[PDB]
RNA sequence: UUGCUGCAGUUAAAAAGCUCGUAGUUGGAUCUCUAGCGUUUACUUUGAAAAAAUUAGAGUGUUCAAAGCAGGCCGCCUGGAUACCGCAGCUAGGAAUAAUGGAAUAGGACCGCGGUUCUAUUUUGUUGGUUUUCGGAACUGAGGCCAUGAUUAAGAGGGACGGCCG
RNA sequence: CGAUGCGGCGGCGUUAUUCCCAUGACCCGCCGGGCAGCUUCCGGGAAACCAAAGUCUUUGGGUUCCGGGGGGAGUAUGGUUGC
């Protein structure tokens, strides 16, 4: 089921068997790379970049056409962000809830949900410190 | 019950059954090409799409983001690719 | 001096450092002959030991310590003493009633020769048994392997 | 979450056979399951099976003959010696005439009778009769 | 649910070890609290001096006067009530005699009829009551 | 009726009011040798080491037996065996199973190539002074090659976005 | 097995936004996750009953808390928290 919820939701992406590039795809590996770079400069997230490239330009899977993933391409050049996507998003959700809580002292629900977010930050931070993508002195405030 | 070929299910039963609980996984989504009424240039869009997409040819909205599949604008004709 | 920290003079007891030298060799350069021995059980003596200027009577390469008995390993847990480190040894004790194991650790103080420089916490170290050196130290660091 | 995939695989086969289904679906598929099923087939309990290969992690579809009484997993993987094997085949098997304990040994995954023949201990995976 | 893991020997041993205290027999045995409270102090038989003869009434369903003796022990010098066994054995006992008493049979608990007695008289004045009952001996005068 | 094998917990005695969480335990597919090695263990099989007595057990008519270590043949031919000995520590095979890592701002592997310092203690029959190479190291300025280097994306999990819902 | 709540997917025909589509309200199916219900000799249980309280002598998926005849007793004492 979920991390911090009783729901057993089964809703994710089902990537097809055929890894083969579609015959109708005109864009080449280098052309896609140039597109990813141009998108990345506008200040976007690998998630958003992948969605925009899937919707607009008709690239089913970047890793199939190029042979490398979005964060990996941006890492290889050096247009990758300092904090990983998911940790950054948890921190901005945490500070948003804390900003709400600072006015509302009675909102017990907000306090409970903050505790649940903080737990996700710490559990993800520990993993990133284990893989040595963050420094070992990295704390949360 | 008791005799079904789990190996070779009938293709209509295969399509009905959930995308993740199929014998071999395949997405229900597809890639389709759009022909805008006030333009000559062709564009490709994802069946369940999430961003309002723009045709830079005439600078007009094509498909709308919805709960499921993206609703195309009136006049713009969609056709299945492979 | 660089090597001279204490109240008494530090010097290798085998080495004599007051030979009669003539001016052609005196004014040329200054270098004391450094004593080192090869410990037996296929352990190469580190270059920093045969080249270094450190003075340590408990170094197995450049001191009066003969390595004999058991050769064990351990992981470094505390480097917070003078030329000695606390290492941890993890093992599984088999309980036959249940037919299951329980993990147990032993922390032993080992002497770390000042040759082994820029050695960090967490890496594995192979230690050799020697005569007792302090109250609790009976083992001497022979070689380091990085994590 | 899922731990010891073999446990789910053997439990699935057991329930299917008790219910009287002529085929059973196992997911996911690992070498350990394939070798275990191979040992079960070699002695003539299941017969032919197919490995449906998707790119993620395979599924097995097993033809079931009405022969298998029980197929159990032993968790955790206990350390079994030649001297202790009498005790195990005395405890788990229903008779000394038939039934087999499947050990993973340095030689490979194999039944207890072959383990005695080739003279090597290992880890107990499961039993069937 | 029981933990079955290969490295759970400590958990199982710890649990089994502390859960044995909830057993009535083990706790009464191993904890040195029964022994000091036991009038004999873990001795099969004990010797005492008679205070007085006493008639203890039986339980509700069947009425009778059970003949007994109040005896003060030799080792710890505390008072107990002992039940004389066979018919007319009370006649052979007199006040202020030396008497060997044994446990009744039910491991220091009561009897079917006679309430609040643990002990029974086996010897009187260094002579077995069976011998005085069967007339194989006579009370030393 | 203390349950590791092997017990219970809706009503018989029993699941914390509820969620988070460190230690603890458990953890998804996937990779077919050049006197030094090979990535290191756990596991398993073999070997030496391990006091007798005891226990199992060979031989032996104590008159039988529990025993004992004696005895048997007409000066002789005998016996006083053998096995087990948790764990851990030594020793040599196996490599299924289970942990661990070998190259990701390439100071990565493998090949021949430029130089700085020092040294081996053979050499100009032996002997004193300079310069050497060979034997052997760290530091580097480049070059060629790798089919050059990232398995999959769990009906595991986090996060993103879309239109709702209460 | 028929309903139901939220979302998605496909499809005759009624209606409203005049009409065409396109959105609502219905109608008939499907898929996933929830609140449940009816039926059943799957199988359990001492039974009452339970599609879990099933897959248990054909006994091992992972892990936490926890009971050991009835009273004494959630009592006495000690510790700790609180005005």
Swiss-Prot record, chain B:
Tissues in which the UniProt entry reports expression: Expressed in a wide variety of actively proliferating cells and tumor tissues.
Pfam families: Ribosomal_S27e
Alphabetical list of InterPro entries matching this protein: Ribosomal_eS27, Ribosomal_eS27_Zn-bd_dom_sf, Ribosomal_zn-bd
Any GO molecular function: DNA binding
Predominant location: cytoplasm
Subcellular location: Cytoplasm; Nucleus, Nucleolus
Cofactor note: Binds 1 zinc ion per subunit.
Gene Ontology BP terms: cytoplasmic translation; ribosomal small subunit assembly; ribosomal small subunit biogenesis; rRNA processing; translation
GO cellular component, one term: cytosol
Superkingdom of source: Eukaryota
Residues given in the record as Zn(2+) binding sites: 36, 39, 55, 58
Physiological role: Component of the small ribosomal subunit. The ribosome is a large ribonucleoprotein complex responsible for the synthesis of proteins in the cell. Required for proper rRNA processing and maturation of 18S rRNAs. Part of the small subunit (SSU) processome, first precursor of the small eukaryotic ribosomal subunit.
Self-association state and partner proteins as the record states: Component of the small ribosomal subunit. Part of the small subunit (SSU) processome, composed of more than 70 proteins and the RNA chaperone small nucleolar RNA (snoRNA) U3.
Protein name per the record: Small ribosomal subunit protein eS27
Organism: Homo sapiens
Classification of source organism: Eukaryota, Metazoa, Chordata, Craniata, Vertebrata
Curated annotation (Swiss-Prot), chain C:
N-acetylalanine modified-residue sites: 1
Entry keyword annotation includes Cell division: no
Entry's Gene Ontology cellular component terms: cytoplasm; cytosol; cytosolic ribosome; cytosolic small ribosomal subunit; extracellular exosome; focal adhesion; membrane; nucleolus
Modified residues (Citrulline): 21
Keyword vocabulary terms for this entry: Acetylation, Citrullination, Cytoplasm, Lipoprotein, Methylation, Nucleus, Palmitate, Phosphoprotein, Ribonucleoprotein, Ribosomal protein, RNA-binding, rRNA-binding
Compartments, record wording: Cytoplasm; Nucleus, Nucleolus
PTM: Citrullinated by PADI4.
Lipidation (S-palmitoyl cysteine): 59
Acetylation keyword on record: yes
GO annotation, biological process: cytoplasmic translation; ribosomal small subunit biogenesis; translation
Alphabetized InterPro entries for the sequence: NA-bd_OB-fold, Ribosomal_uS17, Ribosomal_uS17_arc/euk, Ribosomal_uS17_CS, Ribosomal_uS17_N
PROSITE patterns the UniProt entry points to: RIBOSOMAL_S17
Modified residues (Phosphoserine): 66, 109
Modification N6-acetyllysine occurs at: 37, 44, 57
GO molecular function: RNA binding; rRNA binding; structural constituent of ribosome
Described function: Component of the small ribosomal subunit. The ribosome is a large ribonucleoprotein complex responsible for the synthesis of proteins in the cell. Part of the small subunit (SSU) processome, first precursor of the small eukaryotic ribosomal subunit. During the assembly of the SSU processome in the nucleolus, many ribosome biogenesis factors, an RNA chaperone and ribosomal proteins associate with the nascent pre-rRNA and work in concert to generate RNA folding, modifications, rearrangements and cleavage as well as targeted degradation of pre-ribosomal RNA by the RNA exosome.
Family to which the UniProt record says this protein belongs: Belongs to the universal ribosomal protein uS17 family.
UniProtKB/Swiss-Prot annotation, chain D:
Residues found modified as N6-succinyllysine: 87
Keyword annotations: Cytoplasm, Diamond-Blackfan anemia, Nucleus, Ribonucleoprotein, Ribosomal protein
Cellular component terms (Gene Ontology): cytoplasm; cytosol; cytosolic ribosome; cytosolic small ribosomal subunit; extracellular exosome; membrane; nucleolus; nucleoplasm
Subcellular location(s) per record: Cytoplasm; Nucleus, Nucleolus
GO molecular function, one term: structural constituent of ribosome
GO BP, sorted A to Z: cytoplasmic translation; positive regulation of cell cycle; positive regulation of cell population proliferation; response to virus; ribosomal small subunit biogenesis; translation
Chief location of this protein within or outside the cell: cytoplasm
Signal peptide from the UniProt entry: none
Taxonomy, superkingdom: Eukaryota
Keyword Nucleus on entry: yes
Keyword set includes Ribonucleoprotein: yes
InterPro entries: Ribosomal_uS8, Ribosomal_uS8_CS, Ribosomal_uS8_sf
Disease: Diamond-Blackfan anemia 20: A form of Diamond-Blackfan anemia, a congenital non-regenerative hypoplastic anemia that usually presents early in infancy. Diamond-Blackfan anemia is characterized by a moderate to severe macrocytic anemia, erythroblastopenia, and an increased risk of malignancy. 30 to 40% of Diamond-Blackfan anemia patients present with short stature and congenital anomalies, the most frequent being craniofacial (Pierre-Robin syndrome and cleft palate), thumb and urogenital anomalies. DBA20 inheritance is autosomal dominant.
Database matches in NCBIfam families: PRK04034.1
HAMAP family, sorted: Ribosomal_uS8_A
Family, as annotated: Belongs to the universal ribosomal protein uS8 family.
Protein name: Small ribosomal subunit protein uS8
Source species of the chain: Homo sapiens (Human)
UniProtKB/Swiss-Prot annotation, chain E:
One Gene Ontology biological process: cytoplasmic translation
Pfam family, one: Ribosom_S12_S23
Presence of keyword Endoplasmic reticulum: yes
UniProt key word Heme: no
Modified residues (N6-succinyllysine): 53
Residues recorded with modification N6-acetyllysine: 134
PTM annotation (3-hydroxyproline): residues: 61
Main location: cytoplasm
PROSITE patterns tied to this protein: RIBOSOMAL_S12
Region called Disordered, residue ranges: 1-25
Basic residues compositional bias, start-end: 1-19
MF annotations from Gene Ontology: RNA binding; structural constituent of ribosome
Localisation: Cytoplasm, Cytosol; Cytoplasm; Rough endoplasmic reticulum; Nucleus, Nucleolus
Function text: Component of the ribosome, a large ribonucleoprotein complex responsible for the synthesis of proteins in the cell. The small ribosomal subunit (SSU) binds messenger RNAs (mRNAs) and translates the encoded message by selecting cognate aminoacyl-transfer RNA (tRNA) molecules. The large subunit (LSU) contains the ribosomal catalytic site termed the peptidyl transferase center (PTC), which catalyzes the formation of peptide bonds, thereby polymerizing the amino acids delivered by tRNAs into a polypeptide chain.
Illness the protein is tied to: Brachycephaly, trichomegaly, and developmental delay: An autosomal dominant developmental disorder characterized by brachycephaly, ciliary trichomegaly, dysmorphic features of the face and hands, hearing loss, and developmental delay with short stature. Intellectual disability and autism spectrum disorder may be present in some patients.
Assembly behavior: Component of the 40S small ribosomal subunit. Part of the small subunit (SSU) processome, composed of more than 70 proteins and the RNA chaperone small nucleolar RNA (snoRNA) U3.
